[PDB]
């Protein structure tokens, strides 16, 4: 268990205590009164389970936090609504993305398949050809290893199916790639992996989601926020322009969506004139677009036409 390049700044949280006490008040950045004093005392419960349980290994989660906290009185927790703030505070003060501190979350960043072997390190006490579900990057992204890179492109897809069938037919061999499914919004495990390859490998990465804005936001949750990105990436996923010409069945959209379309525009977050152009198409067409729908035009179709077709004209 490493975590010292951080355990250092994790103790440095304290230090700004005496140097803070001996001379004057004790504001961070705000302390001094009731909710700002208590919110602090809980510093303790914090730097207590951490620095003293970093060299003894064991790692735990949020709704456990709410429990290992029922120990330190005059500091316990009334609701698991605390876990965030504090832990989310740590991310800001000790400049250490949550996990670094030895925290596991709610979910499992499984689903990944491609040509590149690797190992991790801790916990104990191939990636080219493991199994089907194979590797499930778990609650961490800094326990690494590499040395094997015979694929020149990574793949971002979402579906308890499209990815699945993108396995059978494949793509993993005569078409490079590195597969990684995501299941809805991709948080830590996953993302910090996407990024880890878009910086330490110079290897591209594209997103392939359905049409619903609920997918077009999954690129933005990897595009930036909401250490967790890959900004230089593009979306070869179902873009409003790559379906007008590709026949494909459709479906009617509702109220919650149209109010979601004026939100990814009347709020310019990564709102380039190219995600603004294809989006404008959404306003027009006035219809949705599943992701596995290609199956309508041939089963061996996705694995043949769309992907490559759209993949040669990078942009």
């Amino acid at each position: 268990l490493a975590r010292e390049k951080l355990l250092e700044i994790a103790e440095k949280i304290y230090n700004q205590f005496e140097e803070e006490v001996v001379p004057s008040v004790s504001l961070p950045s705000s302390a001094k009164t009731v909710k700002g004093a208590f919110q602090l005392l809980k510093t303790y419960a914090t730097d207590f389970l951490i620095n003293e349980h970093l060299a003894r290994n064991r790692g735990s989660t949020l709704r456990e936090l709410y429990y290992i906290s029922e120990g330190w009185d005059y500091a316990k927790f009334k609701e698991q609504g605390e876990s965030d703030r504090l832990i989310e505070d740590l991310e800001i003060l000790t400049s250490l993305q949550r996990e670094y501190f030895h925290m596991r979350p709610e979910e499992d960043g499984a689903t990944m398949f491609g040509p590149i072997e690797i190992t991790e390190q801790t916990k104990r006490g191939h990636c080219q050809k493991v199994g089907e579900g194979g590797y499930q990057i778990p609650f961490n992204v800094e326990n690494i290893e590499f040395q094997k890179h015979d694929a020149s492109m990574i793949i971002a897809i979402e579906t308890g199916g499209m990815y699945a069938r993108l396995m059978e037919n494949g793509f993993d061999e005569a078409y490079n790639a590195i597969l990684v499914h995501l299941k809805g919004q991709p948080a830590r495990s996953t993302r910090r992996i996407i990024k880890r390859m878009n910086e330490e490998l110079g290897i591209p990465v594209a997103v392939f989601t359905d049409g619903d804005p609920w997918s077009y936001r999954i690129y933005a949750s990897v595009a930036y926020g909401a250490f967790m990105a890959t900004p230089a990436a593009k979306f070869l996923g179902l873009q409003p322009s790559d379906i007008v010409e590709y026949e494909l069945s459709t479906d009617k959209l509702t109220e919650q969506d149209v109010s979601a379309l004026r939100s990814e525009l009347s709020d310019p977050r990564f709102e380039s004139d190219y995600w603004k152009e294809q989006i404008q198409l959404q306003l027009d067409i006035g219809k949705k677009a599943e992701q596995q729908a290609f199956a309508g035009k041939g089963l061996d179709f996705v694995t043949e036409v769309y992907l490559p077709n759209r993949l040669k004209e990078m942009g």
Binding site: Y14, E18, A37, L41, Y44, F48, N51, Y74
Partner: protein, 581 residues
């Protein structure tokens, strides 16, 4: 209200609202909106804290019976028609309830007309006397009434007079704010009265309250010019008769007015004209004189008001205010304002304000009422009640605004609100303010104590904290939590720094943060300073310094060796403001 000509029931069905009867819900309440006041109007005259029982049974599909027991002096046999019917005209410009007689008559009528069962009445004048029972009716056309039963019923415990009315209306709704609220409203303002209410189906709200101090005597008067108009002069002249020091209260000003109109200071009263009237009317306007009368109204009372609420609710901090009698274009008026804060009240917002007009209540559409307006026209949050909106501050409160005046400025032609007169709101305001501040003081004090207990915990919190920063950082220990704590409540910290050598320099530093004068002792065996002032007791001596530092002063006291280590074992006392005083 006119003096009609030929039509009786119609007058009603035509003013079937301007009067007060539109719907099933207000049908009943109007009946009581009368009933209960005649009574107070009665008793308040010569017969003490009057108690009033008022029932209402459910009779049939949608009809109701309403009992209203008096306790007053009962009513003269040949005066029933006159008090239970109302076809009177002509006088009287004194302070009370219902806007001129139209009262109870209305009630009788509606009952008489809706269901139809005559109208029961029962009364006793005093101890030994017959107790009469009357069944009244008003048979249309022939306006004058028509008595129908004048027997003598045995019993009653003589001294009062009950009315029993049956009429298709609707009491039933008592939630949303209708009846209970009326008597409760009536209850709180007329402290000098016991109100028991037994509502259909069985229940019983007893507003048995007191401090038997009959109201200030209602008084009458002549008018004052300003407030007189076109209709007035026609009335004054056309009928009765020098017409200046005779019918216009508060000689030299008689002969001085005649000229400014075009009339001779001697000509006769009546039959002057229809066009030479608009000239004398202003003969007053342009010559403002002395003043109407102050000795003329009857406020409820700074005290009673107080009582009124404290007894009929569940508040926490209260404030009353009965301002001096002000006046507008002729009509005298006094406004009293009381305010009560939180408790049984409502959690957040929804401020409740019940208005009171010359002792009558009001519960119909606040919108527009000079009262509500004034309520919105001033301050708000920065006073104590944190409530945004743009009018009407909200939270757990309750405001009472009262107005009195021989005649009252009402908006709609059916007494339901007050017209925004300049000289009136200009009063209510500084009047609602009159307490709007006494509250602040409370809150400023109340909320304050909170900012006195918040602290008490940031001193049993700031403590273990710098104690968590120990059994976790191998640094000596919990390093004087005191210096900081003292800097919080901002009193003034007095500590003692100490260093050891081949000597023993020890310094007592003190620094304030508020402005006082201090006395500081310190007992020990000897010593080797920034000016001492020693006295000696037993063996070990006492070094008493004397300082007066303020604002953010920081002074430092020093000295030297003798023995060692052991020293860390004291706590130096002072004298002013441990430390006595």
């Amino acid at each position: 209200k006119k003096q009609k000509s030929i039509s009786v029931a119609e007058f009603f069905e035509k003013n079937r609202q301007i009067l007060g009867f539109d719907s099933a819900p207000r049908s009943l309440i109007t009946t009581v909106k009368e009933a209960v006041d005649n009574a107070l109007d009665a008793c308040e005259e010569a017969g003490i804290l009057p108690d009033i029982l008022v029932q209402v049974e459910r009779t049939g599909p949608d009809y109701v019976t309403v009992i209203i027991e008096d306790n007053g002096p009962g009513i003269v046999r040949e005066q029933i028609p006159k008090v239970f019917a109302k076809l009177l005209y002509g006088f009287h410009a004194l302070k009370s309830r219902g806007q001129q007689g139209i009262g109870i008559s209305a009630a009788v009528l509606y009952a008489q007309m809706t269901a139809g069962r005559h109208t029961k009445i029962l009364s006793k004048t005093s101890p030994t006397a017959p107790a009469h029972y009357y069944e009244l009716m008003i048979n249309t056309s022939t306006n004058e009434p028509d008595i129908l039963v004048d027997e003598v019923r045995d019993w009653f415990r003589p001294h009062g007079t009950q009315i029993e009315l049956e009429m298709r209306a609707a009491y039933v709704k008592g939630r949303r704010q209708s009846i209970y609220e009326y008597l409760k409203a009536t209850a709180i303002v007329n402290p000098h009265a016991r109100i028991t209410l037994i509502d259909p189906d069985g229940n019983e709200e007893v507003f048995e309250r007191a401090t038997d101090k009959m109201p200030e005597p209602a008084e009458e008067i002549l008018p004052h010019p300003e407030g007189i108009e076109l209709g007035t002069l026609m009335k004054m002249l056309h009928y009765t008769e020098p017409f200046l020091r005779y019918s216009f209260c508060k000689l030299l000003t008689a002969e001085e007015i005649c000229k400014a109109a075009g009339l001779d200071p001697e000509i006769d009263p009546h039959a002057l004209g229809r066009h030479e009237a608009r000239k004398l009317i202003e003969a007053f306007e342009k010559v403002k004189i002395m003043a109407p009368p102050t000795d003329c109204l009857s406020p409820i009372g700074e005290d009673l008001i107080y009582r009124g609420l404290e007894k009929e609710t569940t508040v926490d901090f209260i404030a009353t205010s009965t301002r001096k009698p002000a006046v507008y274009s002729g009509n005298p008026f006094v406004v009293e304002v009381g305010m009560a804060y939180g408790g049984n009240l409502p959690k957040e917002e929804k401020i409740s304000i019940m208005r009171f007009a010359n002792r009558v209540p009001l519960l119909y559409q606040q919108g527009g009422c000079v009262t509500t307006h004034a309520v919105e026209d001033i301050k708000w949050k920065q006073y104590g009640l944190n409530q945004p909106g743009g009018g009407i501050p909200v939270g757990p409160v309750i405001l009472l605004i009262h107005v009195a005046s021989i005649n009252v400025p009402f908006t709609s032609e059916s007494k339901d609100a007050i017209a925004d007169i300049p000289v009136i709101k200009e009063e209510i305001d500084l009047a609602i303010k009159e307490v709007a501040r006494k509250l602040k003081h409370y809150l400023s004090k109340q909320s304050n104590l909170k900012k006195r207990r918040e602290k008490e915990i940031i001193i049993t919190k700031v403590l273990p904290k710098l104690a968590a920063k120990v059994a976790h950082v191998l640094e000596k220990d919990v390093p004087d939590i005191n210096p900081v704590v003292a800097k919080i409540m901002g009193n003034l910290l007095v500590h003692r720094v100490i260093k050891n050598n081949g000597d023993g320099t020890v310094d007592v530093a003190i620094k304030v943060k508020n402005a006082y004068s201090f006395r500081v002792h310190e007992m020990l065996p000897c010593k080797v300073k920034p000016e001492p002032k020693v006295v000696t007791m037993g063996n070990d001596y006492d070094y008493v310094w004397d300082i007066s530092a303020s604002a953010g002063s920081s002074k430092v006291l020093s000295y030297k060796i003798e023995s060692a280590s052991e020293e860390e074992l004291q706590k130096l006392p002072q004298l002013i403001v441990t430390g006595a005083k």
